[PDB]
């Protein structure tokens, strides 16, 4: 019942998937995009600096999807991280670790283009991941770099996913991910940034994300994210900590589409009650002390 050996090619991989995805009551096409985020994952745990720490740390909905699974994560689309020295390197040492492959995957990425975002000094970059399993194409994956922010890489979480095992492939999987904290300071900047006017904030599915990432905390003191949205904040120099949860009047409809898939999750079931859930998170760690 459980694969002995690993899948031979691409047809028995796919083939294989969609069977797991059924078992479990999943999307089939949201598996194969997160075994083909777990590929290029497990590249990115390849890069270490000279001591042996990770040069790469996942972020966004990819770190999301990693620490709650498939059913309690909202999908998304691309492989977010944040680059832990010299973003330019980055490109070459992913390309060569796909030439050298990971069980039997392979990729070839694009070249990377910059974007830009005002409050960083060094821009972000974008490119695609193309994936080959025994060298016949698997999977598309889009890539997003960034550099360094504050503290926002000084320590990591490593999570793992048994999907590739479920399908033969048992070499164990460990991603290197930033922390808690700083993915709340920083969802927190972009919920309630106001953008040079011609572009528009629509961002409303971070404040599912918000909520999904204040459970994940159960307990904890907050005083390290109290920390990390004050050095985020001060860092992008834009408006100041703490902000307001403001709502706007397109996000209606948006934050109802990033609720799709989670009907068994307690989550604010309009983005008024969204919206003033995170403003209440933003309070809870504004009043944090040491
Ligand atoms: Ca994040
Ligand atoms: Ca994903
Ligand atoms: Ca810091
Ligand atoms: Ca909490
Ligand atoms: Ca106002
Ligand atoms: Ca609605
Ligand atoms: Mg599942
Ligand atoms: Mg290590
Ligand atoms: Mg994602
Ligand atoms: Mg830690
Ligand atoms: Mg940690
Ligand atoms: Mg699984
Ligand atoms: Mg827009
Ligand atoms: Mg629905
Ligand atoms: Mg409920």
Same mark, same amino acid.
């Given at each position: 019942k459980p694969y002995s050996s690993p899948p031979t090619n691409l047809r028995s991989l796919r083939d294989r998937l969609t069977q797991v995805a059924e078992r479990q009551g999943v999307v089939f096409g949201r598996?194969?995009?997160?075994? &083909?985020?777990?590929? !290029?994952?497990?590249?990115?745990?390849? @890069?270490?600096?000279?001591?042996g720490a990770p040069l790469l740390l996942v972020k966004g909905g990819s770190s999301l999807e990693l620490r709650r699974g498939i059913p309690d994560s909202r999908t998304a689309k691309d492989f977010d991280t944040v680059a832990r020295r010299d973003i330019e390197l980055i490109h070459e040492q992913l390309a060569d670790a796909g030439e050298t492959g990971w069980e039997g995957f392979t990729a070839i990425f694009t070249a990377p283009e910059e974007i830009d975002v005002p409050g960083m000094p060094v821009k972000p970059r974008r490119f695609?991941?193309? +994936?080959?399993?025994?060298? =016949?194409?698997?999977?598309?994956?889009?890539?997003?770099?960034?550099?360094?922010?504050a503290g926002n890489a000084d320590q990591?979480?490593?999570?793992?996913?048994?999907?590739?095992? @479920?399908?033969?492939?048992?070499? &164990?999987?460990?991603?290197?991910?930033?922390?808690?904290?700083?993915?709340?300071?920083?969802?927190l900047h972009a919920v309630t940034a106001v953008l040079e006017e011609?572009?528009?904030?629509?961002? &409303?599915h971070d404040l599912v994300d918000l909520q999904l990432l204040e459970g994940l905390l159960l307990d904890?003191?907050?005083?390290?994210?109290?920390?990390?949205?004050?050095?985020?904040?001060?860092?992008?120099?834009?408006?100041?900590?703490?902000?307001?949860?403001?709502?706007?009047?397109?996000?209606?409809?948006?934050?109802?589409?990033? +609720?799709?898939? +989670?009907?068994? @999750?307690?989550?604010?079931?309009? !983005?008024?009650? &969204?919206?003033?859930?995170?403003?209440?998170? !933003?309070? =809870?760690?504004?009043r944090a002390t040491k």
């Open positions: 598996l194969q995009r997160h075994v &083909a985020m777990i590929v !290029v994952a497990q590249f990115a745990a390849t @890069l270490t600096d000279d001591t695609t991941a193309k +994936l080959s399993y025994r060298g =016949r194409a698997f999977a598309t994956v889009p890539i997003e770099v960034s550099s360094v922010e990591f979480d490593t999570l793992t996913s048994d999907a590739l095992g @479920l399908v033969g492939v048992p070499a &164990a999987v460990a991603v290197p991910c930033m922390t808690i904290p700083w993915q709340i300071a920083q969802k011609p572009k528009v904030n629509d961002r &409303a904890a003191d907050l005083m390290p994210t109290r920390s990390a949205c004050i050095a985020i904040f001060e860092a992008r120099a834009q408006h100041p900590w703490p902000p307001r949860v403001a709502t706007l009047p397109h996000w209606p409809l948006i934050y109802a589409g990033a +609720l799709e898939g +989670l009907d068994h @999750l307690e989550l604010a079931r309009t !983005v008024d009650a &969204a919206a003033q859930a995170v403003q209440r998170f !933003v309070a =809870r760690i504004d």
